């Protein structure tokens, strides 16, 4: 036991209604929208293959020159009602929005910097319009926020001097001011998801990370705060020096997921994964031929995978400079939405089922002990193997869409074959099991 002032304080999962809502939501969208949408991965005739939102770094653009992109910020097709409708039709229950990425441009009219939507031709408070539009559709809003800020020259990557320590304190005060502004201007915010907290400077200032968490919780009753924010007294991130989770949920799975057989430890805490559609583009990149682009089924598979292991999934979108979405993202959202409309009872408010993993897909568990079999890989044998835990029996199987009864045959002591449906559903599909415990 290492004594710590800025280590974990939550033991186990929060169970207040606000955390239950965060969890039950299950499926979210991410919006990465910032000045990077304008060049879209390309600078002075060179298309950089790295993540578009990091182009300032790939092309070594000075801050002042990068931020001049504000003079081109005029997303005339932006319509916050349409964005919220796209999200609603996709079946997302929440949206995480980049309020400020590393570049330092604010999507709200901050009074603490001039690098904001207010000082662009478009002028309008994008963040505020989205908050209202999403909330009107019954969709929760979470705020992404980059502590690392390339526009503020008081930022430091490490503290090598008295002068660095003083500048960095001032940077942290600046940061607090913007955070307070976000929390008070948009009081329906449900979560703050921090990024840009990996540098030695932040790791040396764990206390500030604890403070930011407490400060926002005081301002916003029930707000969630991601693990990525947090560093303890020693500079240990996400989990403290005693191995305890800091913040309200674990937030490292990014472009990867826990192993359904080997990583069952994740079921012990809330957690949230985020993913990109291409391999590694968050902001709008104009050229998606450069890497593998996931299909809707691949995305759905990840969504179900996360829920099957007690986690949320958040699918990223990188809106165009003009304020519309690219055709690939419209198609994706529509395809996810159609699936979720049919099969979402197995996703929303579901969780880990406690069954041994089978090859046909995933199990999820509903609030009233429903066990859903979500089938992604159809056996030529036409039999879906179900091995139940000790004391559990399967009493019925039903095809979710139609209510048709599905034959269940006991094959051994703890195992059944659940038949595939008489007609191949032609897409990943759900069989709902009624189970009984001794």
Decide: 32 and 101 in contact? Cβ < 8 Å.
yes
* Binding region for ligand 16Z (CB under 6 A) out of 48-56, 155-163, 368-376, 430-438: 48-56
Taking the complex as a whole, the smallest distance from the CB of residue 369 to ligand 16Z amounts, in Å, to 35
Taking the complex as a whole, the smallest distance from the CB of residue 93 to ligand 16Z amounts, in Å, to 19
* 111-118 contacts, C-beta under 8 A, 24 or more apart: 111/181, 112/174, 112/177, 112/178, 112/181, 113/151, 113/152, 113/174, 113/178, 115/67, 115/70, 115/151, 117/73
Q: Which lies closer to ligand 16Z via its Cβ, residue 120 or residue 251?
A: 251
**Interacting residues with ligand 16Z between 277 and 306 (CB under 6 A):** 282
* Binding region for ligand 16Z (CB under 6 A) out of 13-21, 47-55, 318-326, 417-425: 47-55
d(CA 383, CA 76): 54
d(CA 18, CA 22): 6
Q: Which residue is nearest to ligand 16Z (CB)?
A: 282
Radius of gyration (C-alpha) of the chain in whole angstroms: 23
Q: Which lies closer to ligand 16Z via its Cβ, residue 320 or residue 358?
A: 320
Residue 391 CB-density burial (10 A; 0-12 exposed, 13-18 middle, 19+ buried): exposed
Taking the complex as a whole, the smallest distance from the CB of residue 422 to ligand 16Z amounts, in Å, to 44
Say how many residues touch ligand 16Z, by CB under 6 A. Answer: 8
* 251-254 contacts, C-beta under 8 A, 24 or more apart: 251/193, 251/226, 251/227, 252/227, 252/228, 253/306, 253/311
Cβ neighbors of 123 (< 8 A, separation 6 or more) are 117
d(CA 274, CA 306): 10
**Interacting residues with ligand 16Z between 197 and 236 (CB under 6 A):** none
Q: Which lies closer to ligand 16Z via its Cβ, residue 24 or residue 42?
A: 42
The contact mask relative to ligand 16Z for 240-279 (x = CB under 6 A, - = no) is --------------x-------------------x-----
Sheet holding 415-419, edge to edge: 383-387, 415-419, 408-412
Q: Which lies closer to ligand 16Z via its Cβ, residue 113 or residue 276?
A: 276
The answer to the question of residue 370 lying near ligand 16Z (CB under 6 A) is no
Taking the complex as a whole, the smallest distance from the CB of residue 274 to ligand 16Z amounts, in Å, to 6
Taking the complex as a whole, the smallest distance from the CB of residue 375 to ligand 16Z amounts, in Å, to 31
Decide: 150 and 100 in contact? Cβ < 8 Å.
no
* Binding region for ligand 16Z (CB under 6 A) out of 46-54, 154-162, 307-315, 330-338: 46-54
Taking the complex as a whole, the smallest distance from the CB of residue 372 to ligand 16Z amounts, in Å, to 29
How would you classify residue 113: left for phi > 0, otherwise alpha for psi between -120 and 50, otherwise beta?
beta
Q: Which lies closer to ligand 16Z via its Cβ, residue 42 or residue 427?
A: 42
Taking the complex as a whole, the smallest distance from the CB of residue 94 to ligand 16Z amounts, in Å, to 16
User: What is the three-class DSSP state of 42?
Assistant: strand
Taking the complex as a whole, the smallest distance from the CB of residue 53 to ligand 16Z amounts, in Å, to 5
The answer to the question of residue 53 lying near ligand 16Z (CB under 6 A) is yes
Taking the complex as a whole, the smallest distance from the CB of residue 144 to ligand 16Z amounts, in Å, to 7
Cβ neighbors of 70 (< 8 A, separation 6 or more) are 35, 105, 115, 119, 120
* Binding region for ligand 16Z (CB under 6 A) out of 49-57, 128-136, 262-270, 329-337: 49-57
Q: Figure out which of the listed residues 4, 19, 29, 51 binds ligand 16Z, where binding follows CB under 6 A.
A: 51
CA atoms within a 13 Å half-sphere pointing along the CA-CB vector of 93: 17
CA atoms within a 13 Å half-sphere pointing along the CA-CB vector of 140: 22
The contact mask relative to ligand 16Z for 161-200 (x = CB under 6 A, - = no) is ----------------------------------x-----
Question: Which has the closest alpha carbon to 392: 437, 335, 340?
Answer: 437
Identify the DSSP state of 309: T
Taking the complex as a whole, the smallest distance from the CB of residue 249 to ligand 16Z amounts, in Å, to 15
* Residues within the interface to ligand 16Z (CB under 6 A): 32, 51, 53-54, 195, 254, 274, 282
């Amino acid at each position: 036991e290492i004594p710590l002032k800025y280590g974990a304080t939550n033991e186990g999962k929060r169970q207040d209604p606000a955390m239950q809502k965060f969890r039950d939501n299950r499926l979210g969208a991410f919006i990465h929208w910032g000045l990077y949408a304008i060049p879209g991965g390309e600078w002075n005739g060179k298309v950089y293959g790295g993540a578009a939102e990091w182009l300032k770094s790939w092309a070594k653009v000075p801050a002042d020159e990068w931020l001049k992109l504000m003079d081109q910020w005029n997303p005339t097709k932006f319509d916050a009602k349409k964005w919220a409708k796209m999200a609603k039709e996709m079946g997302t229950k929440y949206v995480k929005i980049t309020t400020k990425h590393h570049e330092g441009f604010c999507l709200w009219p901050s009074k603490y910097t001039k690098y904001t939507v207010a000082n662009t031709p478009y002028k309008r408070d994008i963040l505020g319009e989205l908050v209202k539009a999403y909330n009107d559709e019954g969709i929760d809003v979470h705020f992404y926020f980059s502590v690392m800020d390339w526009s503020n020259p008081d930022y430091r990557y490490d503290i090598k001097s008295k002068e660095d320590s003083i500048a960095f304190s001032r940077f942290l005060e600046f940061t607090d001011n913007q955070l307070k502004e976000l929390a008070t201007r948009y009081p329906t915010v449900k979560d703050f998801w921090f990024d840009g907290t990996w540098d030695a400077s932040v790791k040396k200032n764990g206390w500030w990370t604890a403070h930011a968490e407490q400060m926002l919780k005081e301002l916003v009753p029930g707000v969630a705060i991601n693990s990525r924010l947090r560093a303890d007294d020693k500079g240990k991130r996400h989990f403290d020096s005693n191995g305890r989770l800091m913040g309200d949920y674990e937030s490292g799975y990014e472009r990867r997921l826990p192993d359904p057989v080997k990583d069952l430890k994740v079921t012990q805490w809330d957690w949230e994964a985020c993913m990109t559609i291409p391999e590694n583009q968050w902001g709008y990149h104009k050229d998606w031929s450069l890497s593998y682009v996931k299909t809707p089924i691949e995305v759905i598979d990840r969504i179900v995978h996360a829920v099957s292991m007690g986690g949320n999934m958040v699918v990223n979108f990188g809106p165009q400079a003009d304020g519309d979405f690219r055709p690939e993202e419209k198609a994706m959202a529509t395809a996810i939405g159609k699936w979720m409309n049919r099969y979402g009872k197995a996703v929303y408010a579901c969780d880990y089922a406690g069954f041994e993993k089978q090859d046909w897909g995933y199990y999820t568990r509903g609030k009233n002990d429903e066990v859903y079999m979500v089938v992604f890989n159809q056996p030529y044998s036409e039999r879906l193997i179900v091995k139940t835990p000790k004391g559990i029996t399967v009493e019925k199987a039903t095809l979710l869409t139609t209510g048709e009864d599905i034959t269940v045959v006991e094959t051994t002591r703890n195992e059944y074959n659940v038949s595939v449906p008489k007609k191949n559903p032609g897409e990943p599909y759900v069989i709902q099991l009624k189970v009984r415990a001794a």
